[PDB]
């Protein structure tokens, strides 16, 4: 029964056909169970390890390395036990990467699983099989059950309240709305069928807790049909798109397999002459192994094997750096999307403001005489909940007792108040107890002291509620008509210790319209036009002007209805009970913006980031707060840039989308508006950050690219967000966006660095196959360079100093390629250089070397025919074509070039003369370690046998530097072109 809130208690019992005193019969239970199912959210279908390792080996680059490992294993089988090192190392990389992925998924938290924590194990129902209550498992509760809840119990299903067995019934509906005060519940129907959950005063929602009381109710919905179950369906339907960099890895792997297959076809096309080669020969099995070994090396030379270790290391370090700035990022890929933020939608109370209220102004009526009117405006000092402060008028200290209107003003503030003040000696600060807006009144009456009580020598703990207690002794608060949004006010019925009176407080428009008289000191005058105009005039200046105050109208019913003539169970009659009032005065309190917020808004407009405020204030004050903190200008038109919840719904779907393109302020929004705003922003391809802190906010937090939770927010809101603000501050968002931009600038530098090395490595392997030369580089050597030799300077590039204008540039387009245009041409020339400089270093040892044979170019290209000891090949040991020294010339050239290419990667276009290499101290130290590790595999005896290397001399190294160092001069000329042409 979805509309149970709008149905009578008799209508709900008649729908299910269940007696309130007997309950559901054993037949009705098993028959309702087969129709509505069990009262539980669906279990989240987790994936197995087998499904997780299949997803790990689903990536195309992973499948290429796995195939290359399989080829290497069968090549090592058909050949020295160091041969199986190449298959084993390749497998260890994939296996280790899988373990990392398995650990990440296990550590990951699911918000749908978190919703279960709001499911009680047990419930209490009355059924026809027993007279007494039955404590059954909440899973077995069906719609139509008669349920009994009490203090401490968690509500097991969406329950329509039938009768309240206690005096009142207060519920903690905080799981839906962050952290909130207890709400009073009744049993009368709510006329609006499209009413929101705040207005369903006759409903108990599954997952909430009973703060006080005891009631009997009938179950309306269970399972996914509850309010907390409908939110689970919205989250289960939301799909998280891949981050732009995750998508770029897909296109890179898809294009890489197309190039590898093309290089293989090119190698075969160049060697088609072997089809005319004589059929009889023993080099055919050799030729297959030759092309199979090249295929293995071609894959290892193309895949950046060390990139996943460098990326996750950069993100893990940035997470620790953001946590120092109170930004808790929960997912590592979210750091990239963090820097791409285009729109920030932020709640006000708590984040944009300090949520610490204090009354700043107040006015009472001074004189009413026809068209002449006079007011007594006041000012209060002290922005904290502490009673320290004084009341001023015209910047002059005054005594509140000398004004009679202020005596009645303070009594309304002290009696029509459910909150209190407490002093904490551990923190040494007065603390609030209840609503922040109500506690501002308790602090105000302590500063006024209308009865001139003596509190100078009182203890600080006693000083907190001293003046409040004095007023409470005078009038006995009988009952309380709680706040409701239909009338936007509350009242209390009081008797002396003089007749009974009612003290009313609430929104100014509703209370003043229900006032027929006006208090003037101790006397009262009928409410007239000129007085009502000037009263509302000051409300507009305090709420819309530069004060940006929240105003409360305080009134009194001098002649309240008799106690017997009032029904304290129908919230519909509460407005009638609060009529024919007498205006007493208006207080104006401020929720101050945080110190750092006004500057963070300027950083956002300097960085092209739009800020959208989300409040619960009226449209007039919301626009005023925007002008105060910097979202709008002081004199800027905002007719089509600010909307309310009702204004936004009355628009067609096309106008709603166009509204979100320019709006910067949304006041009094419905729960579904956060998710709709995200969709409209995504329709313009924005990258949206949204704040929230309740289960209500969870669907929008998951929908947005960067859901933002509060450190004090609910657990479900955190598990549905990418980043959690430890201090709830809005400035933490902007600081994390700056860091995400700084991380990406360094990230794309060591991505271009490692990828350009893989280009030159593939050119090296291609030149070997296309010319028929011996293998100048071995997959075992290429793995060491990509994982260790180039991995250390790549990590050091992640510590590059960020640009000082990084927050002075618009947000980066998500589809911006990492390498394109002239940079695509540069890494082709660097790749064409590395490929030629590596195979040439080995050919130098095989020909023009003093310590190597003077093998001719024909013999080196036809080295697979030395086995015959052909007279065509001058007499020589054929094993020389398998010598370790020529591979050390090629490897030491690649290592030294990559150390040089790492310096060229410090800046995209700025010359090394302008930006010297000693800017990044970590990069110089990484090159020394990578070079120190190069001599480790050349001299410490176990390693040269494995890597097929033999140490070089002081002369052979000088030949490496002859070919390697001009890399710096080449890229410098390519940088000079981009800068000046
Ligand atoms: C890999 C090795 C080789 C040899 C190769 O064939 O490479 C080609 C190739 C696949 C390219 C092309 C390359 O073509 C050429 O060399 C043309 C032939 C030249 C030789 C001719 C001889 C006659 C490029 C190399 O050519 C040059 C010069 O740079 C540029 C560009 O690469 C990138 O931008 C790198 C993204 C890495 C990249 C990959 C992943 C990634 N992941 N983030 C994460 C973030 C967070 C978490 C996880 C992950 C981010 C980035 C591409 O064009 C690329 O394919 C594409 O689609 C582009 C747009 O990526
Ligand atoms: Na999200």
């Amino acid at each position: 029964m979805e509309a149970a809130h709008s149905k009578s208690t008799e209508e709900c019992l008649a729908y299910f056909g269940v007696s309130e005193t007997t309950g559901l019969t054993p037949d009705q239970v098993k028959r309702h169970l087969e129709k509505y199912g069990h009262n539980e959210l669906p279990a989240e279908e987790g994936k197995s390890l087998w499904e997780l390792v299949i997803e790990q080996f689903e990536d195309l680059l992973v499948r290429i390395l796995l195939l290359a490992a399989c080829i290497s294993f069968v090549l090592a089988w058909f050949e020295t036990i160091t041969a199986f090192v190449e298959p084993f190392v390749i497998l260890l990389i994939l296996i280790a990467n899988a373990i990392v992925g398995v650990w990440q998924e296990r550590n990951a938290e699911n918000a749908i699983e978190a919703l279960k924590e709001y499911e009680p194990e047990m419930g209490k129902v009355y059924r026809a099989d027993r007279k007494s209550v039955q404590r059954i498992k909440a899973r077995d509760i069906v719609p139509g059950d008669i349920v009994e809840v009490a203090v401490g119990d968690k509500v097991p299903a969406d329950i329509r309240i039938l009768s309240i067995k206690s005096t009142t019934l207060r519920v903690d509906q905080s799981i839906l709305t962050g952290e909130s005060v207890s709400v009073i519940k009744h049993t009368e129907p709510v006329p609006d069928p499209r009413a929101v959950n705040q207005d369903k005063k006759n409903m108990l929602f599954s997952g909430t807790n009973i703060a006080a009381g005891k009631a009997l109710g009938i179950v309306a919905t269970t399972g996914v049909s509850t309010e907390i179950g409908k939110i689970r369906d919205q989250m289960a339907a939301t799909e998280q798109d891949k981050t732009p960099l995750q998508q770029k890895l897909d296109e890179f792997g898809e294009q890489l397999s197309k190039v590898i297959s093309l290089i293989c076809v090119a190698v075969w096309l160049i060697n088609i002459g072997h089809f005319n080669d004589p059929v009889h020969g023993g080099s055919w099995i050799r030729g297959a192994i030759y092309y199979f070994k090249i295929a293995v090396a071609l894959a290892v030379a193309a895949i950046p094997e060390g990139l996943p270790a460098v990326i996750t290391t950069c993100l893990a370090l940035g997470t620790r750096r953001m946590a120092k700035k109170n930004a808790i990022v929960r997912s590592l890929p979210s750091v990239e999307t963090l820097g791409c933020t285009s729109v920030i939608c932020s709640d006000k109370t708590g984040t944009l403001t300090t949520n610490q209220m204090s009354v700043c102004k107040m006015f009472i009526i001074d004189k009413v005489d026809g068209d002449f009117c006079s007011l007594n405006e006041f000012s209060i000092t002290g922005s904290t909940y502490a009673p320290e402060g004084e009341v001023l008028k015209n910047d002059k200290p005054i005594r509140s007792g000398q004004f009679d209107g202020l005596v009645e003003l303070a009594t309304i503030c002290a009696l029509c108040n459910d909150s209190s003040l407490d002093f904490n000696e551990t923190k040494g600060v007065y603390e609030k107890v209840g609503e922040a807006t109500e506690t501002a009144l308790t602090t105000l009456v302590e500063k006024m002291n209308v009865f001139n009580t003596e509190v100078r020598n009182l203890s600080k703990v006693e000083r907190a509620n001293a003046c409040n207690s004095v007023i409470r002794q005078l009038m006995k608060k009988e009952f309380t008509l709680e706040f409701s949004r239909d009338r936007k006010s509350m009242s209390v019925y009081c008797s002396p210790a003089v007749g009974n009176k009612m003290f009313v407080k609430g929104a100014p428009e509703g209370v003043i319209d229900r006032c027929n008289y006006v208090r003037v000191g101790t006397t009262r005058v009928p409410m007239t036009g000129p007085v009502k105009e000037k009263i509302l005039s000051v409300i507009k200046e305090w709420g819309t002007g530069r004060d940006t105050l929240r105003c409360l109208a305080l009134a009194t019913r001098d002649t309240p209805p008799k106690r017997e003539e009032m029904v304290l169970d129908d919230s519909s009659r509460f407005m009638e009970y609060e009529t024919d009032l007498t205006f007493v005065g208006v207080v104006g309190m401020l929720d101050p913006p945080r110190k750092e917020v006004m500057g963070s808004i300027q950083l956002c407009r300097d960085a092209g980031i739009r800020v959208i405020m989300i409040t619960g204030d009226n449209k007039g004050t919301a626009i005023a707060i925007c002008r105060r903190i910097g979202i709008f200008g002081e004199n800027e038109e905002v007719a089509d840039r600010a909307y309310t919840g009702r204004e936004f719904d009355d628009l067609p779907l096309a106008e709603q989308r166009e509204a979100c393109r320019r709006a910067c302020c949304f006041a009094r929004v419905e729960p579904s508006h956060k998710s709709k705003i995200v969709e409209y922003l995504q329709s313009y391809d924005e990258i949206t950050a949204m704040t929230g802190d309740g289960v209500n906010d969870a669907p929008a937090l998951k929908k947005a690219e960067i859901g933002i939770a509060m450190g004090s927010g609910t657990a479900v809101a955190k598990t549905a967000s990418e980043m959690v603000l430890a201090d709830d501050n809005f400035s933490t968002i902007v600081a994390a966006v700056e860091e995400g931009r700084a991380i990406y600038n360094n990230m794309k530098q060591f991505i271009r660095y490692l990828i350009s090395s893989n280009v030159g490595e593939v050119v090296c392997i291609f030149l070997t196959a296309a010319l028929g030369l011996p293998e100048a580089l071995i997959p075992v050597q290429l793995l060491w360079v990509n994982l260790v030799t180039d991995g250390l300077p790549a990590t050091a590039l992640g510590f590059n100093p960020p640009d000082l204008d990084i927050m002075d540039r618009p947000p980066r387009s998500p589809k911006e390629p990492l390498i394109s245009g002239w940079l695509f041409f540069r890494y082709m020339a660097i790749g064409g250089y590395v490929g030629a400089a590596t195979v040439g270093a080995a050919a130098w040892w095989f020909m023009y070397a003093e310590d190597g044979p003077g093998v001719t170019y024909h013999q080196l290209t036809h080295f697979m025919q030395c086995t015959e000891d052909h007279p065509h090949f001058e007499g020589l040991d054929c094993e020389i074509f398998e010598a370790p020294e020529p591979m050390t010339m090629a490897l030491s050239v690649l290592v030294t070039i990559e150390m040089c290419n790492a310096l060229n990667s410090l800046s995209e276009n700025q010359s090394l003369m302008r930006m010297p290499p000693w800017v990044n101290i970590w990069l110089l130290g990484s090159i020394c370690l990578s070079m120190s590790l190069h001599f480790l595999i050349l001299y410490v005896d176990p390693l040269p046998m494995i890597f097929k290397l033999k140490a070089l001399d002081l002369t052979q190294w000088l030949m490496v530097l002859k070919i390697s160092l001009p890399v710096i001069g080449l890229d410098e000329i390519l940088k000079f072109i981009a800068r000046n042409y």
Side-chain angles (χ1 to χ4, degrees), residues 245 249 255-256 259 302 311 751 755 762 818-819 824 827-828:
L245 252 47
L249 197 152
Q255 291 294 88
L256 187 142
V259 174
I311 288 185
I751 287 176
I755 290 303
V762 169
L818 286 179
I819 304 171
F824 185 92
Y827 291 159
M828 274 191 59

PDB file of all heavy atoms in Angstrom, residues 245 249 255-256 259 302 311 751 755 762 818-819 824 827-828, ligand 1:
ATOM      1  N   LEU A 245      40.705   8.492 -18.093  1.00  0.00           N
ATOM      2  CA  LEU A 245      41.974   7.792 -18.274  1.00  0.00           C
ATOM      3  C   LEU A 245      41.766   6.289 -18.412  1.00  0.00           C
ATOM      4  O   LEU A 245      42.462   5.632 -19.194  1.00  0.00           O
ATOM      5  CB  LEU A 245      42.918   8.101 -17.114  1.00  0.00           C
ATOM      6  CG  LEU A 245      44.101   9.009 -17.446  1.00  0.00           C
ATOM      7  CD1 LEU A 245      43.636  10.215 -18.247  1.00  0.00           C
ATOM      8  CD2 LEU A 245      44.807   9.446 -16.174  1.00  0.00           C
ATOM      9  N   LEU A 249      43.015   3.949 -21.605  1.00  0.00           N
ATOM     10  CA  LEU A 249      43.724   2.675 -21.596  1.00  0.00           C
ATOM     11  C   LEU A 249      43.056   1.667 -22.520  1.00  0.00           C
ATOM     12  O   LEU A 249      43.737   0.816 -23.103  1.00  0.00           O
ATOM     13  CB  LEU A 249      43.807   2.128 -20.169  1.00  0.00           C
ATOM     14  CG  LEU A 249      44.820   1.020 -19.857  1.00  0.00           C
ATOM     15  CD1 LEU A 249      45.246   1.105 -18.401  1.00  0.00           C
ATOM     16  CD2 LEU A 249      44.265  -0.365 -20.158  1.00  0.00           C
ATOM     17  N   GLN A 255      44.258  -0.054 -30.017  1.00  0.00           N
ATOM     18  CA  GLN A 255      45.111   0.371 -31.121  1.00  0.00           C
ATOM     19  C   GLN A 255      46.463  -0.330 -31.085  1.00  0.00           C
ATOM     20  O   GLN A 255      47.102  -0.495 -32.130  1.00  0.00           O
ATOM     21  CB  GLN A 255      45.298   1.890 -31.092  1.00  0.00           C
ATOM     22  CG  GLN A 255      44.040   2.673 -31.425  1.00  0.00           C
ATOM     23  CD  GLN A 255      43.583   2.466 -32.858  1.00  0.00           C
ATOM     24  OE1 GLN A 255      42.823   1.543 -33.155  1.00  0.00           O
ATOM     25  NE2 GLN A 255      44.041   3.332 -33.755  1.00  0.00           N
ATOM     26  N   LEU A 256      46.912  -0.753 -29.901  1.00  0.00           N
ATOM     27  CA  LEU A 256      48.216  -1.398 -29.797  1.00  0.00           C
ATOM     28  C   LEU A 256      48.195  -2.791 -30.415  1.00  0.00           C
ATOM     29  O   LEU A 256      49.158  -3.195 -31.078  1.00  0.00           O
ATOM     30  CB  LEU A 256      48.653  -1.455 -28.335  1.00  0.00           C
ATOM     31  CG  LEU A 256      50.072  -1.945 -28.046  1.00  0.00           C
ATOM     32  CD1 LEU A 256      50.666  -1.150 -26.904  1.00  0.00           C
ATOM     33  CD2 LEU A 256      50.062  -3.423 -27.708  1.00  0.00           C
ATOM     34  N   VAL A 259      48.441  -2.491 -34.136  1.00  0.00           N
ATOM     35  CA  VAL A 259      49.770  -2.173 -34.648  1.00  0.00           C
ATOM     36  C   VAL A 259      50.678  -3.394 -34.591  1.00  0.00           C
ATOM     37  O   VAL A 259      51.446  -3.650 -35.524  1.00  0.00           O
ATOM     38  CB  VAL A 259      50.368  -0.984 -33.876  1.00  0.00           C
ATOM     39  CG1 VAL A 259      51.805  -0.748 -34.300  1.00  0.00           C
ATOM     40  CG2 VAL A 259      49.537   0.262 -34.107  1.00  0.00           C
ATOM     41  N   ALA A 302      56.307  -3.474 -26.479  1.00  0.00           N
ATOM     42  CA  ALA A 302      55.177  -2.576 -26.683  1.00  0.00           C
ATOM     43  C   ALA A 302      54.421  -2.274 -25.394  1.00  0.00           C
ATOM     44  O   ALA A 302      53.936  -1.153 -25.215  1.00  0.00           O
ATOM     45  CB  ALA A 302      54.214  -3.167 -27.715  1.00  0.00           C
ATOM     46  N   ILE A 311      51.541   4.190 -11.648  1.00  0.00           N
ATOM     47  CA  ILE A 311      50.273   4.907 -11.535  1.00  0.00           C
ATOM     48  C   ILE A 311      49.673   4.721 -10.146  1.00  0.00           C
ATOM     49  O   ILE A 311      49.318   5.694  -9.471  1.00  0.00           O
ATOM     50  CB  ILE A 311      49.301   4.452 -12.638  1.00  0.00           C
ATOM     51  CG1 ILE A 311      49.745   5.000 -13.996  1.00  0.00           C
ATOM     52  CG2 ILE A 311      47.880   4.888 -12.315  1.00  0.00           C
ATOM     53  CD1 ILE A 311      48.781   4.701 -15.126  1.00  0.00           C
ATOM     54  N   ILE A 751      53.574   9.221 -18.095  1.00  0.00           N
ATOM     55  CA  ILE A 751      52.893   8.349 -19.045  1.00  0.00           C
ATOM     56  C   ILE A 751      53.477   8.537 -20.439  1.00  0.00           C
ATOM     57  O   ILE A 751      53.779   7.565 -21.140  1.00  0.00           O
ATOM     58  CB  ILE A 751      51.374   8.604 -19.022  1.00  0.00           C
ATOM     59  CG1 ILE A 751      50.760   8.041 -17.738  1.00  0.00           C
ATOM     60  CG2 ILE A 751      50.709   7.990 -20.247  1.00  0.00           C
ATOM     61  CD1 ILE A 751      49.279   8.328 -17.587  1.00  0.00           C
ATOM     62  N   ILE A 755      55.647   5.547 -22.405  1.00  0.00           N
ATOM     63  CA  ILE A 755      55.082   5.141 -23.689  1.00  0.00           C
ATOM     64  C   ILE A 755      56.061   5.426 -24.823  1.00  0.00           C
ATOM     65  O   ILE A 755      56.179   4.641 -25.771  1.00  0.00           O
ATOM     66  CB  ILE A 755      53.723   5.828 -23.919  1.00  0.00           C
ATOM     67  CG1 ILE A 755      52.674   5.265 -22.960  1.00  0.00           C
ATOM     68  CG2 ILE A 755      53.261   5.652 -25.356  1.00  0.00           C
ATOM     69  CD1 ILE A 755      52.487   3.769 -23.072  1.00  0.00           C
ATOM     70  N   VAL A 762      60.019  -0.892 -29.764  1.00  0.00           N
ATOM     71  CA  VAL A 762      59.395  -1.644 -30.849  1.00  0.00           C
ATOM     72  C   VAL A 762      60.112  -1.375 -32.165  1.00  0.00           C
ATOM     73  O   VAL A 762      60.268  -2.276 -32.998  1.00  0.00           O
ATOM     74  CB  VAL A 762      57.894  -1.317 -30.936  1.00  0.00           C
ATOM     75  CG1 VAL A 762      57.297  -1.868 -32.222  1.00  0.00           C
ATOM     76  CG2 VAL A 762      57.169  -1.893 -29.736  1.00  0.00           C
ATOM     77  N   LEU A 818      46.459  12.248 -24.726  1.00  0.00           N
ATOM     78  CA  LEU A 818      47.732  12.481 -24.054  1.00  0.00           C
ATOM     79  C   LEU A 818      48.847  12.793 -25.046  1.00  0.00           C
ATOM     80  O   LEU A 818      49.713  13.628 -24.764  1.00  0.00           O
ATOM     81  CB  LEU A 818      48.099  11.268 -23.200  1.00  0.00           C
ATOM     82  CG  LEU A 818      47.281  11.131 -21.917  1.00  0.00           C
ATOM     83  CD1 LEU A 818      47.689   9.898 -21.139  1.00  0.00           C
ATOM     84  CD2 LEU A 818      47.465  12.369 -21.070  1.00  0.00           C
ATOM     85  N   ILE A 819      48.843  12.133 -26.203  1.00  0.00           N
ATOM     86  CA  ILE A 819      49.856  12.328 -27.234  1.00  0.00           C
ATOM     87  C   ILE A 819      49.142  12.510 -28.566  1.00  0.00           C
ATOM     88  O   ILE A 819      48.414  11.613 -29.009  1.00  0.00           O
ATOM     89  CB  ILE A 819      50.842  11.149 -27.311  1.00  0.00           C
ATOM     90  CG1 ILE A 819      51.501  10.902 -25.952  1.00  0.00           C
ATOM     91  CG2 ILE A 819      51.895  11.410 -28.374  1.00  0.00           C
ATOM     92  CD1 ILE A 819      52.328   9.632 -25.892  1.00  0.00           C
ATOM     93  N   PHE A 824      52.929  13.932 -31.042  1.00  0.00           N
ATOM     94  CA  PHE A 824      52.924  12.641 -31.720  1.00  0.00           C
ATOM     95  C   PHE A 824      54.117  12.519 -32.657  1.00  0.00           C
ATOM     96  O   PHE A 824      54.725  11.448 -32.769  1.00  0.00           O
ATOM     97  CB  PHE A 824      51.611  12.465 -32.486  1.00  0.00           C
ATOM     98  CG  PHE A 824      51.449  11.113 -33.124  1.00  0.00           C
ATOM     99  CD1 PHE A 824      50.806  10.089 -32.450  1.00  0.00           C
ATOM    100  CD2 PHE A 824      51.922  10.871 -34.404  1.00  0.00           C
ATOM    101  CE1 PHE A 824      50.647   8.847 -33.034  1.00  0.00           C
ATOM    102  CE2 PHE A 824      51.768   9.631 -34.993  1.00  0.00           C
ATOM    103  CZ  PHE A 824      51.129   8.618 -34.307  1.00  0.00           C
ATOM    104  N   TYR A 827      57.621  12.028 -30.428  1.00  0.00           N
ATOM    105  CA  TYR A 827      57.872  10.682 -29.930  1.00  0.00           C
ATOM    106  C   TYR A 827      58.030   9.663 -31.049  1.00  0.00           C
ATOM    107  O   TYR A 827      58.488   8.545 -30.786  1.00  0.00           O
ATOM    108  CB  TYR A 827      56.753  10.262 -28.975  1.00  0.00           C
ATOM    109  CG  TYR A 827      56.770  11.036 -27.677  1.00  0.00           C
ATOM    110  CD1 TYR A 827      55.634  11.135 -26.885  1.00  0.00           C
ATOM    111  CD2 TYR A 827      57.926  11.672 -27.247  1.00  0.00           C
ATOM    112  CE1 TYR A 827      55.654  11.848 -25.698  1.00  0.00           C
ATOM    113  CE2 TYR A 827      57.956  12.384 -26.067  1.00  0.00           C
ATOM    114  CZ  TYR A 827      56.820  12.469 -25.295  1.00  0.00           C
ATOM    115  OH  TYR A 827      56.860  13.180 -24.120  1.00  0.00           O
ATOM    116  N   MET A 828      57.659  10.016 -32.281  1.00  0.00           N
ATOM    117  CA  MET A 828      58.034   9.203 -33.430  1.00  0.00           C
ATOM    118  C   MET A 828      59.508   9.382 -33.776  1.00  0.00           C
ATOM    119  O   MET A 828      60.202   8.403 -34.071  1.00  0.00           O
ATOM    120  CB  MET A 828      57.160   9.554 -34.634  1.00  0.00           C
ATOM    121  CG  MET A 828      55.848   8.808 -34.684  1.00  0.00           C
ATOM    122  SD  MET A 828      55.014   9.034 -36.263  1.00  0.00           S
ATOM    123  CE  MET A 828      56.249   8.406 -37.394  1.00  0.00           C
TER     124      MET A 828
HETATM  125  C1  LIG B   1      53.243   1.327 -27.816  1.00  0.00           C
HETATM  126  C2  LIG B   1      54.243   1.235 -28.920  1.00  0.00           C
HETATM  127  C3  LIG B   1      54.116   1.416 -30.237  1.00  0.00           C
HETATM  128  C4  LIG B   1      55.277   1.268 -31.178  1.00  0.00           C
HETATM  129  C5  LIG B   1      52.830   1.783 -30.902  1.00  0.00           C
HETATM  130  O1  LIG B   1      52.393   1.260 -31.897  1.00  0.00           O
HETATM  131  O2  LIG B   1      52.224   2.812 -30.292  1.00  0.00           O
HETATM  132  C6  LIG B   1      51.188   3.469 -31.049  1.00  0.00           C
HETATM  133  C7  LIG B   1      49.959   3.585 -30.186  1.00  0.00           C
HETATM  134  C8  LIG B   1      49.283   2.369 -29.626  1.00  0.00           C
HETATM  135  C9  LIG B   1      49.646   4.877 -30.048  1.00  0.00           C
HETATM  136  C10 LIG B   1      50.571   5.842 -30.748  1.00  0.00           C
HETATM  137  C11 LIG B   1      51.602   4.901 -31.398  1.00  0.00           C
HETATM  138  O3  LIG B   1      51.675   5.056 -32.831  1.00  0.00           O
HETATM  139  C12 LIG B   1      52.900   5.167 -33.369  1.00  0.00           C
HETATM  140  O4  LIG B   1      53.911   5.191 -32.718  1.00  0.00           O
HETATM  141  C13 LIG B   1      52.833   5.248 -34.869  1.00  0.00           C
HETATM  142  C14 LIG B   1      54.009   4.580 -35.581  1.00  0.00           C
HETATM  143  C15 LIG B   1      55.334   5.300 -35.365  1.00  0.00           C
HETATM  144  C16 LIG B   1      56.547   4.580 -35.934  1.00  0.00           C
HETATM  145  C17 LIG B   1      56.622   4.590 -37.451  1.00  0.00           C
HETATM  146  C18 LIG B   1      57.906   3.996 -38.006  1.00  0.00           C
HETATM  147  C19 LIG B   1      58.003   4.095 -39.511  1.00  0.00           C
HETATM  148  C20 LIG B   1      51.363   6.850 -29.874  1.00  0.00           C
HETATM  149  C21 LIG B   1      52.068   6.119 -28.746  1.00  0.00           C
HETATM  150  O5  LIG B   1      52.483   7.327 -30.716  1.00  0.00           O
HETATM  151  C22 LIG B   1      53.422   8.215 -30.288  1.00  0.00           C
HETATM  152  C23 LIG B   1      54.397   8.488 -31.379  1.00  0.00           C
HETATM  153  O6  LIG B   1      53.452   8.702 -29.195  1.00  0.00           O
HETATM  154  C24 LIG B   1      50.512   8.019 -29.334  1.00  0.00           C
HETATM  155  C25 LIG B   1      49.221   7.830 -28.548  1.00  0.00           C
HETATM  156  O7  LIG B   1      49.549   7.181 -27.283  1.00  0.00           O
HETATM  157  C26 LIG B   1      49.214   7.811 -26.147  1.00  0.00           C
HETATM  158  O8  LIG B   1      48.634   8.864 -26.111  1.00  0.00           O
HETATM  159  C27 LIG B   1      49.656   7.026 -24.949  1.00  0.00           C
HETATM  160  C28 LIG B   1      48.524   6.623 -24.014  1.00  0.00           C
HETATM  161  C29 LIG B   1      48.974   5.626 -22.948  1.00  0.00           C
HETATM  162  C30 LIG B   1      48.002   5.385 -21.818  1.00  0.00           C
HETATM  163  C31 LIG B   1      47.607   4.099 -21.483  1.00  0.00           C
HETATM  164  C32 LIG B   1      46.877   3.854 -20.334  1.00  0.00           C
HETATM  165  C33 LIG B   1      46.485   4.904 -19.514  1.00  0.00           C
HETATM  166  N1  LIG B   1      45.859   4.568 -18.275  1.00  0.00           N
HETATM  167  N2  LIG B   1      45.623   5.535 -17.517  1.00  0.00           N
HETATM  168  C34 LIG B   1      45.201   5.125 -16.211  1.00  0.00           C
HETATM  169  C35 LIG B   1      44.886   6.039 -15.211  1.00  0.00           C
HETATM  170  C36 LIG B   1      44.478   5.590 -13.966  1.00  0.00           C
HETATM  171  C37 LIG B   1      44.383   4.240 -13.708  1.00  0.00           C
HETATM  172  C38 LIG B   1      44.699   3.330 -14.693  1.00  0.00           C
HETATM  173  C39 LIG B   1      45.107   3.763 -15.943  1.00  0.00           C
HETATM  174  C40 LIG B   1      46.794   6.204 -19.897  1.00  0.00           C
HETATM  175  C41 LIG B   1      47.523   6.436 -21.050  1.00  0.00           C
HETATM  176  C42 LIG B   1      48.181   6.924 -29.242  1.00  0.00           C
HETATM  177  O9  LIG B   1      48.030   7.495 -30.544  1.00  0.00           O
HETATM  178  C43 LIG B   1      48.473   5.397 -29.237  1.00  0.00           C
HETATM  179  O10 LIG B   1      47.210   4.832 -29.690  1.00  0.00           O
HETATM  180  C44 LIG B   1      46.209   5.660 -29.317  1.00  0.00           C
HETATM  181  O11 LIG B   1      45.063   5.412 -29.562  1.00  0.00           O
HETATM  182  C45 LIG B   1      46.781   6.869 -28.578  1.00  0.00           C
HETATM  183  C46 LIG B   1      45.931   8.129 -28.730  1.00  0.00           C
HETATM  184  O12 LIG B   1      46.861   6.502 -27.207  1.00  0.00           O
END
